[PDB]
């Protein structure tokens, strides 16, 4: 096992030991899907209010 990359400072130290070597959507598209759900809600609500109006 070889220690490598040893660094030291007053607060601690740091190193690496090797036991063995190797063997995004737009703002538009998000606004689109937020508003597509919003009007799915508003359709469903509207349908309820139509039924309640009957």
């Amino acid at each position: 096992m070889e220690v490598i990359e040893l660094n030291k400072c007053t607060s601690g130290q740091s190193f690496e030991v090797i036991l063995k070597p190797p063997s995004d959507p737009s703002l538009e598209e998000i606004q689109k899907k937020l508003e597509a759900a919003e009007e799915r809600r508003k359709y469903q609500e509207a349908e309820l209010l139509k039924h309640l109006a009957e």
């Binding site: 609500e45 309820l48 209010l49 309640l52 109006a53």
Partner: protein, 428 residues
């Protein structure tokens, strides 16, 4: 999600509603004056859920009192907390409804409903974030039944995005001899299936049997029946009125309790069962609460839980006790009776503990179950309904208010469908 608007309708709705306001007022340190004289500040943290504050540091129930008859509300006015209700929220007529759903829903109730909704609106508009409504009513009479479900459909049309919750008293021929109650109740269930989010089935058949067989009361009074009701209503609203994690508002309760929109009828349970002014000197152990609260003899709907399966369950434990022991007792009822909990809803039992116990008891527990066995209750109403309906008996009392036979046929069909949808899910 803070404020609840409470509406109570009809004789049963006002009698059980008044006892509810009595019970929780004392739990929160409010006296008939409307003033606070309690010790714990746990009492006031969520007081706004059910009480409007006035300037004199007086607390006024967000409560609306409806009847097509003055009588009972006069009786509420002169009872113990009758002076705590703000006077303009008494909304009543003189007709009466004559135990007639059609009168409450279509004629007499029509005349009065708008003036009720004006009180609702005033109380609604002055909420910071209204979470929805709770209604108390019997399904067997005319006002609470017919006008109550009319009110629900109106409120739903003007507040379509709020939660609608009822405490619905189911008729039993053991304590009523009014022949048309199966009609009123079936017509009401049709409405409840469509326009409420969560309904507590408070079965007068269960209330009577508990009083007679368990509390050994040979002549149960309405006060005896309502003593069980008010304990239940205290227990099942505990998570809403005190600080906590689980089911702390109506919507979260609905999300936790209702896996299918129509299957929203809950079977409450309670332990220990007490009679009015009883002794009750031995506190229950946590294992006693847990076995008792799941016992069929403790349920407030006359249904056998072993005859169905639980979809969801909420358990609320009140008093000072070991959360560890509550956990292990809860885990043991599930692990020992696991067949009775549907496998396809994992972890469907949610448990809550509140430190403040109800008056009279150091230790108590309230059960709230979405069991497919509730179908037994709707079967019973259905059998009493069709026995008269197949001969079209007593229909003239309804057709003379303008109703048609087919509205009955639609109602009994929807309730029979409800029954069949419960049986569906009882067979995974």
């Amino acid at each position: 999600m803070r404020e609840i608007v409470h509406i109570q309708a009809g004789q049963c709705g006002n009698q059980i509603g008044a006892k509810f306001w009595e019970v929780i007022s004392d739990e929160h340190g409010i006296d008939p004056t409307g003033s606070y004289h309690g010790d714990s500040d746990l009492q006031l943290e969520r007081i706004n859920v059910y009480y409007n504050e006035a300037t004199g540091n007086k607390y006024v129930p967000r409560a609306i009192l409806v009847d097509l008859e003055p009588g009972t509300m006069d009786s509420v006015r002169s009872g113990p907390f009758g002076q705590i209700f703000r006077p303009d929220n008494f909304v009543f007529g003189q007709s009466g409804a004559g135990n007639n759903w059609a009168k409450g829903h279509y004629t007499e109730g029509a005349e009065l409903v708008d003036s009720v909704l004006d009180v609702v609106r005033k109380e609604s508009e002055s909420c910071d974030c209204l979470q929805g409504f709770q209604l108390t009513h019997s399904l067997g009479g005319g006002t609470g039944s017919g006008m109550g479900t009319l009110l629900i459909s109106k409120i739903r049309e003007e507040y379509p995005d709020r939660i609608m919750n009822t405490f619905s008293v189911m008729p039993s021929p053991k304590v009523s001899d009014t022949v048309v109650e199966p009609y009123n109740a079936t017509l009401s269930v049709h409405q409840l299936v469509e326009n409420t989010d969560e309904t507590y089935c408070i079965d007068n058949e269960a209330l009577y049997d508990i009083c007679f067989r368990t509390l050994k009361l040979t002549t149960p009074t309405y006060g005896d029946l309502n003593h069980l009701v008010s304990a239940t209503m205290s227990g099942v609203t505990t998570c809403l009125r005190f600080p906590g994690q689980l089911n702390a508002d109506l919507r979260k309760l609905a999300v936790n309790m209702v896996p299918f929109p129509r299957l929203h009828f809950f079977m409450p349970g309670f332990a220990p069962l007490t009679s009015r002014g009883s002794q009750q000197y031995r506190a229950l152990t946590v294992p006693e609460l847990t076995q008792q609260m799941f016992d069929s003899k403790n349920m407030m709907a006359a249904c056998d839980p072993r005859h169905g399966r639980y979809l969801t369950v909420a358990a609320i434990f009140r008093g000072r006790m070991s959360m560890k022991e509550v956990d292990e007792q809860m885990l043991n009822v599930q692990n020992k009776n696991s067949s009775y909990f549907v496998e396809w809803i994992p972890n469907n039992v949610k448990t809550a503990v509140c430190d403040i116990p109800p008056r009279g008891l150091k230790m108590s527990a309230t059960f709230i179950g979405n069991s497919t066995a509730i179908q037994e209750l709707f079967k019973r109403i259905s059998e009493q309904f069709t026995a008269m309906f197949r001969r079209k008996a007593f229909l003239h009392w309804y057709t003379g208010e303008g109703m048609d036979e087919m509205e009955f046929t639609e109602a009994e069909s929807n309730m029979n469908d409800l029954v069949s949808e419960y049986q569906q899910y009882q067979d995974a």
